[PDB]
Amino acid sequence: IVRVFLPNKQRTVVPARCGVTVRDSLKKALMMRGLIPECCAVYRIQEKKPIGWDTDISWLTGEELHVEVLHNFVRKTFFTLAFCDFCRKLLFQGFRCQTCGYKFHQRCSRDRSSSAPNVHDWEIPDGQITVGQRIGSGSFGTVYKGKWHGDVAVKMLNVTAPTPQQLQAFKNEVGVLRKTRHVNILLFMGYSTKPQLAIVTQWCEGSSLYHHLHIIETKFEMIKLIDIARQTAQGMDYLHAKSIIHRDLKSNNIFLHEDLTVKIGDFGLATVKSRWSGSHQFEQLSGSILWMAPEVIRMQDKNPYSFQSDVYAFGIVLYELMTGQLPYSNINNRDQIIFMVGRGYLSPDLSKVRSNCPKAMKRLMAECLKKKRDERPLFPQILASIELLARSLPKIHRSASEPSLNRAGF
Amino acid sequence: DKNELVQKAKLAEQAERYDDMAACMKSVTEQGAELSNEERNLLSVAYKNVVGARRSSWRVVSSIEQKTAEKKQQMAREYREKIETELRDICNDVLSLLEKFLIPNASQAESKVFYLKMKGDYYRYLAEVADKKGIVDQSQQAYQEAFEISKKEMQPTHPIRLGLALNFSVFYYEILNSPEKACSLAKTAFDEAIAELDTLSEESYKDSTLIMQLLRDNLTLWTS
Amino acid sequence: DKNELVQKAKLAEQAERYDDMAACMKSVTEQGAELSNEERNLLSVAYKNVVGARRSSWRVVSSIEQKTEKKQQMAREYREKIETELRDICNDVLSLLEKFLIPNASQAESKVFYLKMKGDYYRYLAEVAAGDDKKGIVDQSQQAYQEAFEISKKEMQPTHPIRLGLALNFSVFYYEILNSPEKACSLAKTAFDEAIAELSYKDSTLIMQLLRDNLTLWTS
Amino acid sequence: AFLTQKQKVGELKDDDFEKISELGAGNGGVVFKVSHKPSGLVMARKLIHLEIKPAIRNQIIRELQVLHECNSPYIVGFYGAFYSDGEISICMEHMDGGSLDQVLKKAGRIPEQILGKVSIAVIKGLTYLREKHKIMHRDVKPSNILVNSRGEIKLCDFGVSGQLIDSMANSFVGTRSYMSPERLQGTHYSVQSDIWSMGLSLVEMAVGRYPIPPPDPMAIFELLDYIVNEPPPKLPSGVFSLEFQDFVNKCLIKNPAERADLKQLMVHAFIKRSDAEEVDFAGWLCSTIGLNQ
Ligand SMILES: CNS(=O)(=O)Nc1nccc(Cc2c(C)c3ccc(Oc4ncccn4)cc3oc2=O)c1F
Ligand SMILES: [Zn+2]
Ligand SMILES: [Zn+2]
Known part of the structure; x- marks a missing residue:
């Protein structure tokens, strides 16, 4: 009896024999887990030292083992944005696995080259910044729902009296980071540094x-x-x-x-x-x-x-x-x-x-x-x-x- | 004739030029002779992508109709039908090819299993597309005698049996809507293959395994 | 109807069959009406795939054509069957371009793309054409790019997407076809650095990486 | 003989408290103190907030009432908890010494003559927790040892809810880690962990220096590299008795096989030696905190 663990810590005691490898013996319990004996790794410990699949059970008797994971390729030619996944180039023509959705170029596993793709100050001052109420917490601060010509937010933080050269970089962090105009990102009205330092954002339902x-x-x-x-x-x-x-x-x-x-x-x-x-x-x-x-x-x-x-x-x-x-x-x-x-x-x-x-x-x-x-x-x-x-x-x-x-x- | 027509598909498969090798494999099996395993699967390979693509399209085309007036809604209706007519004709080409020439000349067991397996599969595509009960029933029969002859000859891990079992299970749920019948046979073929998974042919070693994990993916999806 | 034409393609736009809409975008402007942006975008995307499907089919069978002789001879007539469609498919646009598209350009961005579109479609013919018609086709795209490329500088932004798309296409034309990499690598950098100096955004940046990705390859 | 009673309290709601001041700034939770008009007696207000499923939150509060039967003069008594303000209010006894986190930050160091007395209380306060309730502290740290100017020292903040053990385990960040190697290597051997979590905690009292960076700051992850990769620290000699090293070194061994059981920790001479000599604790703090009587 050679007990082995499985992914999700499941247990199976495979038979102990001599002359036949782990591969097909373990494959039974493996394949109800949907694990081919060519893609997984199993360990023997004398932390976690891997062992393959061509090992006879004679040396493996009475040992606990783990089961841990470490392709049918049609051709295709990709008619939209398709990035290779072995050298991360841009892919136009090349393989693709039927089920696992993983595309790559055979070249990277007189030749051509690439081409085009298939197209398709200014700081919030104090006073007017209506400091909000109790809102909550997080990793470094707190939200404060502001009321100034619309819906905004106010934050607090953990540096009280920084050096003067720190604060000028803070005018530059926003300049780098106030330019984030997008549809996935809420607007940045600025910040309030005359009171305790803040990072003003919007509020969302x-x-x-x-x-x-x-x-x-x-x-x-x-x-x-x-x-x-x-x-x-x-x-x-x-x-x-x-x-x-x-x-x-x-x-x-x-x-x-x-x-x-x-x-x-x-x-x-x-x-x-x-x-x-x-x-x-x-x-x-x-x-x-x-x-x-x-x-x-x-x-x-x-x-x-x-x-x-x-x-x-x-x-x-x-x-x-x-x-x-x-x-x-x-x-x-x-x-x-x-x-x-x-x-x-x-x-x-x-x-x-x-x-x-x-x-x-x-x-x-x-x-x-x-x-x-x-x-x-x-x-x-x-x-x-x-x-x-x-x-x-x-x-x-x-x-x-x-x-x-x-x-x-x- | 055959030798050139084998190559003309081995050159239209590589370039994803399917409709050429859909209309050239039809021309190598209407030679009236038997098919060896080489051109056997290419005949299935050829149509599967040809008949599948419009199904892969009609699935996408009809879904947009399921993603919706009287003008915008109409525009998908004519186009989805234009897929239907294209899909109906390509389905009938093999069915006419299967009934008239392929099935009667099916000399070997697993070949006899195979061409019957196609027949139910092909009506299944008309079943999903579409009186209408004759299509679903004839698929059931074509599967039924396909499964019945499958139980005798081949070793019980053969991809054709499991592929049929995997195929025949899908017809039970997605048209008839009887997953419990689908679950059991999928379970039965999957579970039976466990014990019989002794030393296995290296050729079918890869192909059978790919099927079995799909069966569990059917089961594990069907458990809920 | 213009609504029906634009819709019909969009139903096949994602259906993975691209011949069907390519066969209906021709009817969109065979009347010769004014083109807005999106339809003009739908016009472009079609034949690149149809040619690309043929080019990708052209590429692979050429490898068999370059693989070798009883088996190999089957490819040549099969190969010549591809371009005969491919030449016909492309020439439909060039006929369409030189009848209703190019002579009807209105805005600054209208003229630049079609000429590059005209040049690339000539380039696609230039990929395969041989004999006395080889350089004749290649030449007719030298001005097609050149006409637009000099309009790009004076009429549209250094980061406006078409110029990077044109410059990338204009540059790649020099190495694979013209056998002139030096005119190319020294030319990509000009357009590469022009946009990064004064650096609706995703399309812009992917051409940018391709410009650097091609510059690295051109230096290999 | 100690006469502990908590029956005076009635219904507990936020409108029935008026705040006075804050005990101090803790690590995981921040400790307050408040005035309750009906009861009158001062209370310790430990406010920890968990934005969790209300069912999971409700499953824990009902289990916070088992603190009633875990009554002793060794463990801090439980006044009562309730849900409001969106926050969990774990009211506790208000003990005038806060914990021995302030004591070290104020007194600078703690002599050996005091460690002998406190080690008696915890080793039996832990024994009161194990042999009676079949659960152990799991949070043996100096700031969870409430002290007062009445000559008493006591434990607090053990694992009263296995759900809130984990529901807060991803909210108790902290920066100092005394957790045993057996609790970090990937398994649980709770029987021997709390001894290490007390063995390292006392070294923080005897010397007052955080020994994970060895005496003879590191990144929050880097401490655990020391804890579970290389041999454990050991107390300085000279100012500390050699027979006291016989005690701590038996509480700070990685492998539990060499670890001495709790029973072994009362059969030793030193543990029976500390109580042989008496120590005043009424005027000890009053001469270093400024409090009286
Ligand atoms: C840090 N190590 S851990 O074991 O992984 N996690 C935890 N360990 C212990 C504890 C906790 C969380 C926790 C806290 C904060 C608590 C606070 C006061 C309290 O009331 C009380 N009343 C009288 C006497 C003693 N306490 C009971 C408490 O029960 C708890 O489970 C861990 F989250
Ligand atoms: Zn690659
Ligand atoms: Zn795969």
Whole structure:
């Protein structure tokens, strides 16, 4: 008897024999999990040392093992925005998997080149700023609903009397960050620095995505669960075309109104953050720990952020978006989440995802949550694969059916 | 004749020029001779993308009608019918090809299973598109004797049986709306394949596995 | 009716069959009426796919045509069947362009795109054409780009999308066809730096990365 | 012999309290103090807010009433909690010494002669929690040890609700971590964790210096790297007795196999040595806090 775990911690005692490899023996319990014995990894420990599939059970008797995951290729020629996924170029013609939605060029696995695509002061003064009421809290501040010729918001924060050279950069942070005019972003009326420092925004009805996915739990279907992956990646491409890292991507900050209009706020602020306890940029871990990458939890760099650490903060608002629960919702701890997320021992379990989730996404949401940073895709592609299968949903609105043959020749 | 007509599809598949290899595989099987496995699946490969694309289109075309006056609503109606006429004719081409030449000359068991498997599948596309009860019933029969002959010859992990079981399950739910019959046979074919999944042919090793995970995706979707 | 024409394409716009709408955009302006923006956008997107579908079909079968001889000879007549459609499909627009589109340009952005559209459609013919007609077709796009490219500078913004689209198409014409990479890489940088110096936005930036992506390749 | 009673209280609602001042600024929750007109006695107002499902919130409040039967002079008594203002109001006893977080920040250091007395109270206050209620503290930190100028020291803020253990575990950020390696490595061995969480807490009292950056600040994650990768810290000698090192080093070993059971922690001589010598605690704080009687 050689006990082995499974994804979702499930248990199965496979038989112990001699001369026949783990592959087909484990495949039985594996295949009810839908795991081919060519794509997964199993571990033997003398932390977690992987072992393959050609191992006879003679040396494996009486040992506990884990089961952890580590293609039929038709051809196609892509008639809209299609970005390769092995060198992340622009794809016009090339392969595509039938079920997993992952396209790539055979070249990258006298030749041609590329071409065109298939087209389609000024600070809020004190006095008139009507300071609001008790509204709540968050990671670094508080909302105050203002009343001055319309609906606005006021914030507070944690640096009281900064050095004069700090404040002039604050006039430049807004100049970089007041230019965010978009449809996914609420307007920025300015800020009030004569009173305690603020970051003035608008106010929106409805609520955020965290309220919609942890309190009311009015879970939607993919016609809306992929629209939200659209009207939130788009608001995080304009935010990165001009290099303003959100660095605050929370399901609690995605304030959508009427369930049609999607709005995003509460971002930026590298001067209020990076506290000037002296005259440095020493940033601090204030807030939650789920929307944070391994290297933002680690803080092992002076500035460990990136546009990638805004993508590991997009999978967590996506792995929340499908299942309906929240990531790491079973560990009855605080410092255990921080240790593993920072270390690389544990990552969110993808077994708890829905049964009707499109397999084309399994190569998207897994990238937006990879342990490393040099792998997760940048935000223009996120709006690409989510426009792609936002309208390919009526094509795949049925149950399954028998697919085509290989059509792949090497 | 056949040798050139095999290549003319092996050159129109690679360039996604389907309607050429839809109208050239029809011309290599109306030769009146038997089909080896090579040109066998290409005949299915050819039509599946040809007949599927308008179904893949009519699904998209009709959905916009489900996404909606008297002028805008009308405009999809004529166009969706224009898909229907194109889809109806392509369905009948193989059905006429199946009944007149293919099925009578089906010498081998799994081949006899295969061409019958197409027949129900093809009426299924007319079933989803569309008296109307004759289409759904004849698919049920064509599946029915397809499944019945499947139980005898081939090893119980064959893609054709599971593909039929996967196919025949979908007809139960999406037209008749009887998932419990669909769930059981999908479960039965899936579960039975578990025990019989001994050492398996490398050729069908990849193809059978791809089917089985889809069956669970049907089951795991059908559990709710 | 103009409403019916624009709608009918939009029902097939996402249906993945692109020949059907390409066969109805011809009827849109065969009357010769004034073109707004969106319909003019729908006119462009059609034949790029239809040619692209043919070009992508053209590309692959050429590899078989370049693979090798009893089997290989089947490709050539099959190959020549593709362009015979492809040449006919493209020449429909060039006939349409030189009858109702180009001589009816009104605004600053009207003239620039059609000429680049005319040049690229000539380039698509220039991809395959041989013999004495090869350079004759290639030449007729040299001015087609040149006519528009000099209008782009004086009439529309450095970041207005058409110029980057034109510059990228104008630049790529020099390397693959003209066998003139030096005139290209030194030319992309001019348009590359023009927009970034004085840097509705997504279309702009993707051409920008393509400009840098092509500049890197052109330097390879 | 201590005569603890909480029957005087009646219905509890926000309009029946008038605030006086704030006890101090805590880490996870901020502690207040308020005046209740009917009861009259001063109370400790611990306001922690959780925007959670009301059913989950309601499942916890009813479980906060089990604090009534966990009565002792070793654990702070529970006046009563209720839901209002959108916030959870965990009222507690108002003890004039706050906790021993202020004490270290005011007195600068705490001598060995005091640690002997407090270690007696907690090791039995924890025993009152385990052997009776079958649950343990899970939150052994110095700022959860309420003290007063009456000569008494007591514990507070244990795990009263397994739901709010996790519902707040993603809201209790903090910056100092005393959690045991067994509670961080990925499993739970609760029987031995609270000993470490007390072993490290006392070193913060004996020396007053946070030992995770070794004596002989680090990033919030970097502390746990020390905690669960390399051998544990140890108390300085000289000013501390060598037989006191026999106590702390038996409470600060990673592997629970070498950890001594609670029963082993009363069979030691030093734990039975601390109570052999008496210490005044009425005038001790009054000579360093400015309070009287
Ligand atoms: C930090 N470690 S953890 O174990 O992971 N998490 C937690 N551990 C303990 C506790 C908590 C949360 C928590 C708090 C804040 C609390 C506060 C006052 C209280 O009332 C009271 N009354 C009388 C005597 C003692 N308390 C009971 C309480 O119960 C709780 O569960 C963790 F969130
Ligand atoms: Zn590539
Ligand atoms: Zn795949």
